[PDB]
Scaffold this active site. Sequence first.
Site, PDB file in Angstrom:
ATOM      1  N   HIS B  67      -0.957  -3.037 -15.675  1.00 50.15           N
ATOM      2  CA  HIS B  67       0.199  -2.620 -16.432  1.00 50.15           C
ATOM      3  C   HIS B  67       1.460  -3.308 -15.916  1.00 50.15           C
ATOM      4  O   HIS B  67       2.038  -4.092 -16.651  1.00 50.15           O
ATOM      5  CB  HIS B  67       0.362  -1.123 -16.370  1.00 50.15           C
ATOM      6  CG  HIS B  67       1.693  -0.654 -16.840  1.00 50.15           C
ATOM      7  ND1 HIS B  67       1.966  -0.416 -18.170  1.00 50.15           N
ATOM      8  CD2 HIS B  67       2.830  -0.376 -16.159  1.00 50.15           C
ATOM      9  CE1 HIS B  67       3.214   0.000 -18.286  1.00 50.15           C
ATOM     10  NE2 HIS B  67       3.760   0.031 -17.082  1.00 50.15           N
ATOM     11  N   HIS B 115       8.404  -1.201 -10.148  1.00 50.90           N
ATOM     12  CA  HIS B 115       9.045   0.077 -10.469  1.00 50.90           C
ATOM     13  C   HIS B 115       8.102   1.197 -10.027  1.00 50.90           C
ATOM     14  O   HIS B 115       8.540   2.228  -9.507  1.00 50.90           O
ATOM     15  CB  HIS B 115       9.424   0.200 -11.970  1.00 50.90           C
ATOM     16  CG  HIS B 115       8.260   0.179 -12.916  1.00 50.90           C
ATOM     17  ND1 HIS B 115       7.563  -0.974 -13.213  1.00 50.90           N
ATOM     18  CD2 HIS B 115       7.689   1.162 -13.653  1.00 50.90           C
ATOM     19  CE1 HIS B 115       6.598  -0.697 -14.074  1.00 50.90           C
ATOM     20  NE2 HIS B 115       6.654   0.591 -14.359  1.00 50.90           N
ATOM     21  N   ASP B 116       6.801   0.968 -10.174  1.00 57.04           N
ATOM     22  CA  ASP B 116       5.825   2.004  -9.879  1.00 57.04           C
ATOM     23  C   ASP B 116       5.554   2.192  -8.380  1.00 57.04           C
ATOM     24  O   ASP B 116       4.760   3.041  -7.975  1.00 57.04           O
ATOM     25  CB  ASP B 116       4.526   1.688 -10.613  1.00 57.04           C
ATOM     26  CG  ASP B 116       4.476   2.306 -11.995  1.00 57.04           C
ATOM     27  OD1 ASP B 116       5.174   3.323 -12.217  1.00 57.04           O
ATOM     28  OD2 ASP B 116       3.738   1.781 -12.857  1.00 57.04           O
ATOM     29  N   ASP B 266       9.374  -2.090 -19.796  1.00 56.55           N
ATOM     30  CA  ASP B 266       8.448  -1.046 -19.392  1.00 56.55           C
ATOM     31  C   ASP B 266       7.923  -0.340 -20.628  1.00 56.55           C
ATOM     32  O   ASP B 266       6.700  -0.423 -20.932  1.00 56.55           O
ATOM     33  CB  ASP B 266       9.134  -0.056 -18.445  1.00 56.55           C
ATOM     34  CG  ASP B 266       8.192   1.044 -17.944  1.00 56.55           C
ATOM     35  OD1 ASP B 266       8.483   2.233 -18.203  1.00 56.55           O
ATOM     36  OD2 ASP B 266       7.178   0.728 -17.277  1.00 56.55           O
ATOM     37  N   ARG B 436      -3.725  16.354  16.462  1.00 55.05           N
ATOM     38  CA  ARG B 436      -4.604  15.499  15.665  1.00 55.05           C
ATOM     39  C   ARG B 436      -4.086  15.234  14.249  1.00 55.05           C
ATOM     40  O   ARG B 436      -4.194  14.105  13.704  1.00 55.05           O
ATOM     41  CB  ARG B 436      -5.986  16.115  15.643  1.00 55.05           C
ATOM     42  CG  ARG B 436      -6.422  16.316  17.042  1.00 55.05           C
ATOM     43  CD  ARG B 436      -7.880  16.699  17.259  1.00 55.05           C
ATOM     44  NE  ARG B 436      -8.302  16.302  18.607  1.00 55.05           N
ATOM     45  CZ  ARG B 436      -7.938  16.918  19.723  1.00 55.05           C
ATOM     46  NH1 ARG B 436      -7.185  18.004  19.665  1.00 55.05           N
ATOM     47  NH2 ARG B 436      -8.338  16.442  20.893  1.00 55.05           N
TER      48      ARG B 436
END
Lengths: 495, 499
Positions: B67, B115-116, B266, B436
Amino acid sequence: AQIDFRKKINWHRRYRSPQGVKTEHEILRIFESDRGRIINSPAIRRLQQKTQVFPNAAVRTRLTHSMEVQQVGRYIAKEILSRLKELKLLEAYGLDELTGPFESIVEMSCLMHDIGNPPFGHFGEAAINDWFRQRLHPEDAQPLTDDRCSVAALRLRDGEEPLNELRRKIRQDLCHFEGNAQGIRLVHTLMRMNLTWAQVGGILKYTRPAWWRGETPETHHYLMKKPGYYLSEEAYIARLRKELNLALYSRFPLTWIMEAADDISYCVADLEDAVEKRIFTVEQLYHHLHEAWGQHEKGSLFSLVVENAWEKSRSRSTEDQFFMYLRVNTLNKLVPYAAQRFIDNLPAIFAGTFNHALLEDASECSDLLKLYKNVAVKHVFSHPDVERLELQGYRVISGLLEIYRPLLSLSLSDFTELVEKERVKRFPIESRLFHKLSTRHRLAYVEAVSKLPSDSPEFPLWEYYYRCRLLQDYISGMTDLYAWDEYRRLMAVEQ
Amino acid sequence: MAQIDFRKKINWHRRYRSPQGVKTEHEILRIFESDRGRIINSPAIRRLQQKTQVFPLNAAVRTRLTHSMEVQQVGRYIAKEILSRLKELKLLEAYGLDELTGPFESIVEMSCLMHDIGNPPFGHFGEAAINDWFRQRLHPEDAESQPLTDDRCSVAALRLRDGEEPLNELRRKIRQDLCHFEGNAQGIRLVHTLMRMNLTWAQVGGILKYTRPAWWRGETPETHHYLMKKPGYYLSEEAYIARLRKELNLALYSRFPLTWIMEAADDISYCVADLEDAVEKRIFTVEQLYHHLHEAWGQHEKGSLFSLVVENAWEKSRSNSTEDQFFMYLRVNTLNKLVPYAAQRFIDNLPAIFAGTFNHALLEDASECSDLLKLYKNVAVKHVFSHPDVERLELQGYRVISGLLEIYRPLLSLSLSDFTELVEKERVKRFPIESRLFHKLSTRHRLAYVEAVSKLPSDSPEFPLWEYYYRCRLLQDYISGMTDLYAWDEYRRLMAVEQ
Ligand SMILES: [Mg+2]
Ligand SMILES: [Mg+2]
């Protein structure tokens, strides 16, 4: 006689081609159209599901690799172009209005070299070729009355001589599946992207016919190393050489650039990945490098590239820092060297005859690449896990071929009946197997066969050829995961 | 009569070890190339190839990477059309773009590509999960004005104690900010503090899509409603963003020009892709899709936009496989009408887009183009995102992220001294579990924590608040950095549901 890139950057197409006199801008838009064509192709996304070296998100796939490669190829392109600009040679070579197309064709060629590769890579390749070799034994083609070919029509019968030649070519060709050849086929016959001739030229990396037998010409040994095109793509490739003014067995200039780019990316990436996948540590890697090198003259290439990478990365994470710098330094020495190599040999690279890689050399640069490669081959590709996966993939592809074998076993009339009637009553299994093959693939089969004279004595041979070609199309089109899952579902091992 | 000089917006300086002085066109080009090499080879991008777009991961179905890649090409297309539309108007030199063509297009492409980058696992639902969890712990509601007796904040230091008034304000901002996790804000943080890519100022500006502080409370200014829709930066990125506005000559709450371009890009990609994907995943068929489109639209003046785009796509398809042809043409036609419209929109509003104040999208409109995008979106929302499978996966993801947050909660429960002890000593004897858990957090994240906290005056009354803030910020960094599969597997492993 000369160097005119206007005569190589061919912006015409195979169908509905743009015609006549175009401006710089309109040519730019033509090649933009090529970009949009390729980026939105199913074949590219399919790349995001095929494995590179390993099967972990930070580890590269053929897509993110092809993408990093895209940037290295663009870098090399730009450096060549502006080194020609500094030499005041653009106008001289016809490139003054083709800068955009030049860089773009390199980038897109990079983005889709991997496009035609089978599942499990070299081993899917292996699997296919070995299976088919077991069925066709191209070795046995003078005629013998003990010719081990299991396919009736393709045995060499003593007497018929032209038919024997066609039989030879069909057997050899079917037994030489290759990723690049499959990519040409893919881009022409199966996807019908209708790219510019220049772009297709950009794909054609090797120039040997898959049907080739014997030693390759001495003067073309490097360019005819692996099969470049299949017996079915032949008229298309002829047309391609006609449109790009290529001699027989010659190559499209820009290819060299992309090929260089490829090498570079892959080398460093692999080592990095080996350190993510924990195969060896950084300091250990530095050691294996330093040892495999061995000739440390004060201020040599290893010192600059590798040792400076190493020196900085020790004071913010050390592994990432080391590999960042290693990539940077490698690129900053090798990319301009490649560029210069391209320009210094531009007459022969333009003729398409130049029998060498840009980075194949007694050069220190070349030696550095070989250093990386050796270290990977010894200590990465031998990691038992990598080899497990290679064995597995070989079984999976061999197995899918065995499952679909019933289709190659049918007679000409029976299979034709299956294609035409769709669902045949006396062949339940073969029918369902057939419907499992992809639509595009079956269409390609139908189109290819329809173009043949059905009364010719060649027809049954050509049909068997295009049928095997159908099966290889289907199998090599799968992603690793899909091929694996299909093999397990069909074997009733899972639902 | 304001000005338009893009030399004053395409800032090729960096935060650290910046290139300096007078550079040639070529040297500036190479600077932005450097930015490209930086981004393409980042772990964050590959991590994109393992995060899901709409559906889970088939091959031909898109991921945030393929995409973002298609988006990259649409953004480049729009860029080039704007540039040559300005060239045909003989306005490049006039606007300062005559030597910044390369950087212009490149900044758009790379902004698209990442952007993602800051998005959490399971997307909007990871976002949801994070914010809801933290909201349950911090109840930012109770901190609006006036301190309280019944203040439901479970964290000692951040309750509003009546008397202390500057501290109360800092408490307010911390609670709101921690309860407004956002993908874009996390992307700015990611590109600055966690990855230290040291990009050009222009590139970072290209990322900054919204301009509201995450700590913001109440109604946003009327004149900036669209630009302050979602949180754009975190309370921790504040001095950086201030510096950024200083370097790109942005007013308070204003945006970097090129952003609009990428944003447009987009939208376009995603819309058509989703429908295509829905037809691969068998949710509805092509003819059915054509019908839902034709209905949601309305009557025709056979020559309107729908006719051209959609109906020509459908006819050109019908003459035949058919599915692929239809979607190919649909994408082509959509792009060929919308990309130049976006370009034109950009140029027609260039003064306000350049000021960074323009309170609209390029394709947000009473335009037919806009209506076409909305048509696609509606059809997807009604008949794709409601597919029971998509919603199962949304529910699942919400549980997984809520659960990981609950697992790591012991770290947020420690006291200031105890956690500090844990950071310094590494392995603490009386906190086996927390130890941990702490080592499970990523190195880069922990380094960011240490750096942030070390910057603070330890005797200030603000210190415990800032530390709790940066600790929560550490946890959100860790969780939102996971791929969907990893987050899921970690949740299952830690829950002892598998080995
Ligand atoms: Mg490769
Ligand atoms: Mg998007």
